Assembly symmetry: D2
Homo-oligomer: 268 residues x 4
């Protein structure tokens, strides 16, 4: 009876209880969705974290840089949700950039191997996951990825900005493919969320100046947002992802929905 | 139990059974909303049309060019929904441009009096309506207006394009005001919908070349849209408006959601 | 031998020696252009100001709200530059909004008559001037208007933002008409320039909060701009307008060039 | 006495006489610039081609994937233009994507190694070249790269679209670095130019459907462009690059100038 009643949804990207994907998973389950989860590398940790979700959900291993994992993924999902069943939704909440590509390390000093790894995980993998899963998605389905608005440059975000610009472009091409299946593809551009790592960066993990810059970004964000922005609360973001996973945005694809308090619409 | 259960929503803009606002009203009522309707000039016609909606809804007169109508509107709404009750939602589905400002009449030949009238009704009135109704809206509420993507020029749409560009700008300022009330303001940029008037234009009501241009626009739209576009079906648009009226896009304001099949994301 | 050698260019919008148009006129003359000037209302003042330009230029009266002035304009220009000669360039540097539509007066309290007047002068008149002058422009010619980036809302600029959004839309339609003549149409989106009026607003002419907001805008602008921004210097803006008036941007029309230090490309 | 009189400009990207960079080089020399050229792999061919330029220019080898080439580049340039002299301009006209990432090969079938190579050459190298050359650029200098508008998806261009989206993002960060040197960074988004390779693709080199799609793109481009578009003529593009290399766009950085006939401003 919830927003997502009866829907089978794959959620990637949980690593801590502060992960945006954890909150996406929690809200989707509150709204009646049946989930399959995917996790990278630390599956014991991730199972222990996801035990706290309101309902049980199978956890599958997925390193998006691993071709074998991607080749087997649809079969492993079908095993978890049962033969003859398909997915209605896929959430990509995956991002990574080596520390040379973010923070106080100069923009020009990031080696391309590092940048390439970040773009692989943060942008190309959105296509990789759609390739793997569209064959087991139902018409009317929905693929959602997470974005951080890269239309303008900003301090420290550096090559991760570039990776997000690439992701936005990938999403428009994934929509062309997904459309053949009756499936939508979209991104949610979220405001800053104080995940574990972000608090670590604010605390200086990538250099003092980067931490200072993020605090400034956060303060400015809430100021600009006409309805404000609470960086400690991922729930408005998770709700937005569930809106796109639902039946209520049926004519939106290849697009970007901004769950950012309206900040990007305001100069000051 | 629907998406809009318990919500009180004002819907403007119904004039025929093919009006986008009629379909918005129908879907909102299907999803549990309690409506108040507003109508321009032809209230007997509009009552007869809206008798076909699934539930009863009070019809109020509102000419957005009439200062008296706007000054009395909140009191008349409060009378209709009962003292102590406020609105959760407001739908602006109002547009007009004199024939000198659209169609085959040359762009340069539209007198400013005509253009000004079109901008008054199509853009300024979004601010007028927000001014009148924000004092009787609840926190968490939502103001939605209808848009037709004006970021690029196109044949025949002419000064109505300009009016929509102005509307998009107005919406960003209305978000700043609405935010003070805990209310969101957004537009839905819809693909072409074959309303009575559009079929009239396709049939040559504003000149043969304009009709030909709209048919080309419509065909191109469905081609570009990765999930296609059915100009005869307003329901995907109405669903999108209901999504914004709901609780499920709580961090989106001053913004534009595209219910256009994804066409604007694709060149060809 | 200058950039604009041999070119005949009409420059509107001079009212003080700090007007952007004064600096446009000065630079164009330095670069070899032969000018015709147009002025509103205070022609004695404007002649006295423009006596300080490096070369003589005929001054013609043009109130863009006056239909007679617009109807006679091409004939008066042809008289000034000589029969058989046409214009190569037209600069629109005209803007106005009543004080109810800018400053600390609330957004919702601007009467539409005031907003309409501002849109007439600031947006519709770009079309009016193109209508009047395209019949006496040479192929390869260039129409340039002044813009202040309205893609996001901001404090106090209010309905002038809306007028600029409308102008951007008008410019795209003027390009369609101008193209028939082999003429380009573009806008220059300038950073903040401390004209007489702006210093007056900073000094509180439209309310204290508006003045404070502009100082904040100015400071933020220079901070964001990767090459900085000097609000006291209009010359980089004037140079950009001359670039568009020249032969060196032959494939750019309906477009917006940002002479803003790069500020709009940067979040922080 | 030309537009670029006295300026020392590095031009990369010549491989045939139809290369956009050849035409950029030709026009810059016509306008008084003194050039240094860089070439990839086929230096005998490139010397023979560039012998046809109006003036002599040293050719240097530069594979942007080669760290040694980049590390030595500034020293080799300084050798060619003489100690104590610096560059005023740098043109990046470099792009590549393996055939798996463009054409009729499905979007999902491009291996990441191929995509990474394309992004390395087409996007990261803009940063690589700026890193190498900013230490030998004069204040007031200008870095220009070539772009093909990737804001919307389109048939066949596929991962090259993604690479261009990344480039646009890189350019905004390169502007932040370049600004420290008093140097601007910008892209020129060109309309389609019928280079050797493009004619090869139109002739079916990357599959019949891709060729058909490009012909459609080309036809639509000229139709939309308000001043038209001649895919056989690179000169308007080269002129635009020279405008950015000149002193006449001094307040534009991190930005994109569209030398596309105005096509991107028009829907139809
Ligand atoms: N935190 C914010 O402020 C913010 C804002 C907007 C968007 N986003 C985006 O939201 C998404 C989730 O980020 P988050 O803030 O929740 O951080 P997070 O660290 O909780 O999530 C990132 C996830 O990426 C996964 N990942 C990394 N490498 C992987 C690989 N090889 N294979 C599979 N998964 C891999 C990690 O295991 C982790 O689960 C990312 O796309 C991020 O860019 C974050
Ligand atoms: N039809 C499409 O293709 C399309 C596409 C995108 C957006 N839109 C927009 O959707 C909205 C509804 O348009 P529609 O196609 O349903 O047409 P419609 O003719 O059914 O609706 C337009 C409404 O505006 C009302 N109106 C006109 N002058 C008014 C005034 N003075 N005061 C109050 N109301 C007034 C009319 O009475 C009518 O109800 C408009 O904003 C239109 O621009 C339409
Ligand atoms: N000053 C800035 O910060 C800034 C920034 C970006 C863009 N702009 C724009 O540049 C242009 C010039 O502005 P400015 O700052 O030089 O101010 P200004 O006051 O010097 O110029 C505005 C001009 O508009 C003219 N004008 C007003 N009503 C008119 C009418 N009825 N007919 C004809 N002309 C009329 C005035 O006489 C004046 O010459 C305007 O379009 C303005 O919006 C200004
Ligand atoms: N042709 C068009 O329609 C078009 C349109 C817009 C933009 N562009 C862009 O203009 C630029 C030039 O393209 P073009 O059409 O003139 O094609 P071109 O083939 O003539 O130029 C591409 C150049 O990239 C060089 N290159 C490839 N790999 C390299 C490497 N490892 N190191 C150094 N250089 C390398 C090639 O040697 C060649 O000189 C590219 O950025 C292209 O994306 C082209
Ligand atoms: O890093 C972030 N913001 C951030 C913003 C500005 C500067 C810097 Br340094 C960082 C947020 C946005 C984002 O994509 N994140 C990712 C970064 C890679 C690992 C997963 C989380 C976290
Ligand atoms: O007119 C429309 N499309 C349209 C598109 C292209 C050219 C021309 Br002429 C028309 C649609 C979009 C739009 O705002 N409409 C309005 C026009 C004013 C009266 C209410 C409906 C109808
Ligand atoms: O007003 C301006 N900036 C400005 C910016 C922010 C808030 C406020 Br209040 C003002 C500048 C930009 C602009 O279009 N101007 C116009 C305003 C109308 C009269 C001519 C000059 C001056
Ligand atoms: O490829 C092009 N257009 C193009 C457009 C649409 C589909 C396809 Br397939 C191709 C043009 C634009 C562009 O970046 N080019 C590059 C491609 C890589 C090698 C150098 C030239 C050529």
């Amino acid at each position: 009876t919830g927003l997502l009643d009866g829907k089978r949804i794959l959620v990637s990207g949980i690593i801590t209880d502060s992960s945006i994907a954890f909150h996406i998973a929690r809200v989707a389950q509150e709204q009646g969705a049946q989930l399959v989860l995917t996790g990278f590398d630390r599956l014991r940790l991730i199972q222990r974290i996801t035990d706290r979700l309101p309902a049980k959900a199978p956890l599958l291993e997925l390193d998006v840089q691993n071709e074998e994992h991607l080749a087997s993924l649809a079969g492993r999902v079908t095993e978890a949700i049962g033969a003859g069943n398909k997915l209605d939704g896929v959430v990509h909440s995956i991002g990574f950039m080596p520390q040379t590509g973010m923070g106080i390390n100069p923009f020009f000093d990031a080696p391309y191997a590092d940048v390439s790894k970040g773009i692989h995980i943060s942008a190309y993998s959105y296509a990789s996951m759609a390739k793997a899963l569209l064959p087991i998605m139902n018409p009317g389905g929905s693929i959602v990825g997470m974005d951080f608005d890269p239309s303008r440059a900003m301090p420290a975000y550096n090559w991760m900005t570039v990776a997000k610009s690439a992701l936005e472009s990938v999403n428009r091409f994934v929509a062309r493919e997904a459309g053949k299946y009756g499936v939508r593809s979209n991104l949610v551009a979220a405001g800053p969320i104080r995940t574990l790592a972000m608090s670590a960066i604010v605390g200086g993990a990538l250099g003092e100046e980067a931490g200072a810059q993020i605090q400034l970004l956060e303060e400015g964000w809430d100021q600009r947002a006409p309805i404000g922005w609470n960086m400690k609360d991922a729930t408005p973001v998770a709700k937005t992802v569930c809106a796109l996973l639902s039946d209520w945005l049926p004519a939106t694809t290849g697009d970007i929905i901004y769950a950012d308090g309206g900040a990007h619409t305001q100069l000051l």
